[PDB]
Amino acid sequence: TRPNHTIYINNLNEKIKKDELKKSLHAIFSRFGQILDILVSRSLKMRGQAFVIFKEVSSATNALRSMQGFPFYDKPMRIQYAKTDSDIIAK
Amino acid sequence: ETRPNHTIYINNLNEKIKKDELKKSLHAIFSRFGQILDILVSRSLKMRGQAFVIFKEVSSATNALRSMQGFPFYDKPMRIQYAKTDSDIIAKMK
Amino acid sequence: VPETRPNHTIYINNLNEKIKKDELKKSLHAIFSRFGQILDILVSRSLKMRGQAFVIFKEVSSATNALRSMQGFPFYDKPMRIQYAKTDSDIIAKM
Amino acid sequence: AVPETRPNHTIYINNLNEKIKKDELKKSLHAIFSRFGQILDILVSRSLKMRGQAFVIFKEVSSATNALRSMQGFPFYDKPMRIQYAKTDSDIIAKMK
Amino acid sequence: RPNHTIYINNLNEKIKKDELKKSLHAIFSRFGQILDILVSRSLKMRGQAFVIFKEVSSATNALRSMQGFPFYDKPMRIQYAKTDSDIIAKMK
RNA sequence: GGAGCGUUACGUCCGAAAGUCGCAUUGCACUCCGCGACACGGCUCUUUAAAAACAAAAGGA
RNA sequence: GGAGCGUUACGUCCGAAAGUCGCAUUGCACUCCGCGACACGGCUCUUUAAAAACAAAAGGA
Ligand SMILES: NC(=O)c1ccc[n+]([C@@H]2O[C@H](COP(=O)(O)O)[C@@H](O)[C@H]2O)c1
Ligand SMILES: NC(=O)c1ccc[n+]([C@@H]2O[C@H](COP(=O)(O)O)[C@@H](O)[C@H]2O)c1
Ligand SMILES: [Mg+2]
Ligand SMILES: [Mg+2]
Ligand SMILES: [Mg+2]
Ligand SMILES: [Mg+2]
Ligand SMILES: [Mg+2]
Ligand SMILES: [Mg+2]
Ligand SMILES: [Mg+2]
Ligand SMILES: [Mg+2]
Ligand SMILES: [Mg+2]
Ligand SMILES: [Mg+2]
Ligand SMILES: [Mg+2]
Ligand SMILES: [Mg+2]
Ligand SMILES: [Mg+2]
Ligand SMILES: [Mg+2]
Ligand SMILES: [Mg+2]
Ligand SMILES: [Mg+2]
Secondary structure (H helix, E strand, O other): OOOOOOEEEEOOOOOOOHHHHHHHHHHHHHHHEEEEEEOOOOOOOOOEEEEEEEEOOHHHHHHHHHHHOEOOOEOOOOEEEOOOOOOOOOO | OOOOOOOOEEEOOOOOHHHHHHHHHHHHHOOOOOEEEEEEEEOOOOOOOEEEEEEEHHHEEEHHHHHOOOOOEEEOEEEEEEEOOOOOHHHHHH | OOOOOOEEEEEEEEOOOOHHHHHHHHHHHHHHHOOOOOEEEEHHHHOOOOOOOOEEOOOHHHHHHHHHOOOOOEEOOEOOEEEEOOOOOHHHHHH | OOOOOOOOOEEEHHHHHHHHOOOHHHHHHHHHHHHHHOOOEEOOOHHHHHHHEEEEEEEHHHHHHHHHOOOOOEEEOEEEEEEEOOOOOHHHHHHHH | OOOOOOEEOOOOOOOOOHHHHHHHHHHHHOOOOOEEEEEEOOOOOOOOEEEEEHHHHHHHHHHHHHOOEEEEEEEEEEOOOOOHHHHHHHHH
């Protein structure tokens, strides 16, 4: 809701495989700043969702609302801030 | 409907026969009903395969209808009927 | 009853009528080929010809050996009944 | 003025590689020309008339204009295509006899 | 990783192997001597092909020049082919 | 309602063919041919037989 | 038993389990993990992966 190092993306094409998605997401979000990591899981609870962990918050914000709705594998991205800090960031 | 007119409208004619040949072939088989004033033929898109026959009298035409309906003509069976309007006619011959 | 006079052509019946023509015609060729050159196999599902086939051999000895070796052989759950053809097949009389 | 060439739903292609069997040539032509719109037929012949040449008959005349403009000089079997609108139906029937 | 061989995908899959090869030659011969075109319609190769050029020069020009080129109504991706080992595994 | 249209499944050929389930049949042929039954969206036209498009969620090889 | 063989339906192509369909699921983690399906006669060899052949009563498009 409130800014954070890590952006929460959902409404993602659930049929892309974990590895292709990460690299696709990397290509289009790396222009915004350094990506620490992208978490992807094809869980029931976690499919269609990604967490991109930026090094700097400013990179996250700039990415969040400039890529909002970006068409990606034929579905518009919905991007919001993660409600908690990612583990790597709060350690 | 289609009120008796001295002009008859004919179609299902073969379209390969030349205008002028078709014209006098029609003249021969239709003169035995009355004195033709004119026969209107053309192979435009909308007059090919069809013709108008104009006698002096309406009796001539009403008789050529019934006598010559289905008549085999260059291997096709003629389809005759009365002209609808002296307008439709002038509108087929552009 | 049966036709015992040797002929180039054997007449099988008691065949399974549910079998399709060219499966039967080719299953027959698979089980009879080893007796000699087969000139033709004739199958017909018509009313009076279903259930039954003619296998034409080049040599009467093939036919005899085929008739004798295969009598009663179980075939699509029916044992073939085999006899000789009452008359020659046309392919034959030419020659 | 110089007159604008009259469009046609059929395009005349030449400077084609004559070493290609005519039935492959059609199929390869369909591969690069179906994007511009529906093809109704492709005309090739082994007669000396049609040597190195073909006609691609489109449904819509707009499609032949896009294909003529987009694929002019396109290299095809290592030989650049020369494309023009076909003239008449009677012209095609002559070279296809 | 520039290489003798290009890997084409997003190819129309409702086309027969023999024709696909001959059509891919008609459009790629311009760039160099094609040593072979590898097509197959297996679940693993369908919609894809390998084109092998004598020289790496030719695969580079082909990859850039023919990128997205519309072909059987579909625009092709041309990527560089991986290793000979990867290729032999995709054919079967 | 009735006719005409057989275009369409991967994508061809059929749809007056075929296949399938019944019922009959133990039968000697060389060209076929027992009986019964079991699909199809749409578009024309209006007792006529033409016109020109067209479906795999509907049948068979 | 186990490997290799994908030839076959009208008759072409296919017949990938680190995979593929189908159904569910819009879900805030830092993590294995929703549910349901994936047919096939036979040949050949015997932990080798070669070699020639081959079925629609068995799966697709
Ligand atoms: N579309 C056509 O050209 C065409 C022609 C004949 C039959 N059919 C189909 O066959 C079915 C039975 O045809 P009829 O009702 O014309 O005998 C129709 O309902 C129609 O679906 C279609
Ligand atoms: N005849 C062949 O060349 C061939 C090859 C592969 C599979 N098959 C069929 O596929 C089935 C499954 O085969 P596998 O036992 O090789 O998985 C076999 O039982 C066989 O029916 C046949
Ligand atoms: Mg993308
Ligand atoms: Mg058996
Ligand atoms: Mg189709
Ligand atoms: Mg058809
Ligand atoms: Mg009918
Ligand atoms: Mg209907
Ligand atoms: Mg049926
Ligand atoms: Mg059949
Ligand atoms: Mg054993
Ligand atoms: Mg196969
Ligand atoms: Mg067929
Ligand atoms: Mg067959
Ligand atoms: Mg599962
Ligand atoms: Mg064998
Ligand atoms: Mg078998
Ligand atoms: Mg398919």
